[PDB]
Design a protein around this nucleic acid. Structure first.
Ligand code: NI
Ligand code: NI
Length: 282
RNA sequence: UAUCUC
């Protein structure tokens, strides 16, 4: 059902998707030229520790700022106050309740808010890190991830899909699914981040990953999502562990009214989706 | 932690 949700969202939001491959590639090249990869190595290791502290977090945050300064695909602080118009009163109540649900759902740090928006995955960073650490040409990484994107037009790629691909694209050996883990940052490799990057490598395909939001399109994008929510009966799961495609898109869109919700640098953003998008039920 | 694996 999950892939069906993703598929139905792609169909419905096709008009907000676009080709961003060369823009991602340009950002990846900017990182390859400008990034301190010894510190990338340092942050990767630090993020993999069983127990992390404010020292580790500062290292992540500083590196993030450096990455953010180099790339052009960035999301910016943009609060949205949703009001009736494109969205009906009923729609606003649905969105309000779902954001409230999202809100309702080891680190040793003084301020947990400094974790917010620092742990995301960005295709350009993924490409840069694979290319540099995998010791191949950027194009080698691009071609490999393109195949992964193609698989993603048909299904969620899994470890087996990945294993098969590696037979023709050895760079993908950098992605050790055994070593991948939750919340270890976009500097470390994972199948999920590789799939997100592959999704940007395609010509067409209506990949959600390529969506751009602006204040002028925010309401229409939300209205389209709500159409699909109704059609397929999508919902925010009450279990604080699962994250389905609807929760995923709603959170990512509502984090900012200006940017690329899935793939931009979002490390300059403060706040969570339920703080950055609010509803005036009036 | 908008992230892991399916
Ligand atoms: Ni050069
Ligand atoms: Ni290939």
């Amino acid at each position: 059902k999950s892939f069906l949700w993703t598929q139905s969202l792609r169909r419905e939001l096709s008009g907000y998707c676009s080709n961003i491959k060369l823009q991602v590639v340009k950002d990846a090249q900017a990182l390859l030229h400008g990034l301190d990869f010894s510190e990338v190595s340092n942050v990767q290791r630090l993020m993999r520790k069983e127990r992390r502290d404010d020292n580790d977090l500062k290292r992540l945050r500083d590196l993030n700022q450096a990455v953010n300064n180099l790339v052009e695909l960035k999301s910016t602080q943009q609060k949205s106050i949703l009001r009736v118009g494109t969205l009906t009163s009923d729609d606003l109540l649905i969105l309000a309740a779902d954001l409230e649900k999202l809100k309702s759902k080891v680190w040793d740090v003084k301020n947990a808010e400094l974790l917010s928006n620092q742990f995301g995955t960005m295709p350009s960073l993924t490409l840069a890190c694979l290319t540099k650490q995998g010791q191949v040409d950027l194009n080698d990484a691009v071609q490999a991830l393109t195949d992964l994107g193609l698989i993603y037009t048909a299904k969620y790629p899994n470890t087996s899909d990945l294993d098969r691909l590696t037979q023709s694209h050895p760079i993908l050996n950098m992605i050790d699914t055994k070593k991948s883990s939750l919340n270890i940052s976009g500097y470390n490799f994972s199948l999920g981040a590789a799939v997100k990057a592959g999704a940007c490598m395609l010509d067409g395909g209506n990949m959600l990953e390529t969506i751009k939001v602006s204040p002028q399109t925010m309401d229409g994008i939300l209205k389209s999502i709500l159409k699909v929510k109704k059609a397929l009966g999508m919902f925010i799961s009450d279990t604080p562990g699962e994250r389905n495609p609807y929760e995923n898109i709603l959170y990512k869109i509502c984090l900012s009214g200006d940017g690329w919700p899935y793939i931009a640098s979002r490390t300059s953003i403060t706040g969570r989706a339920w703080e950055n998008t609010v509803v005036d039920l009036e």
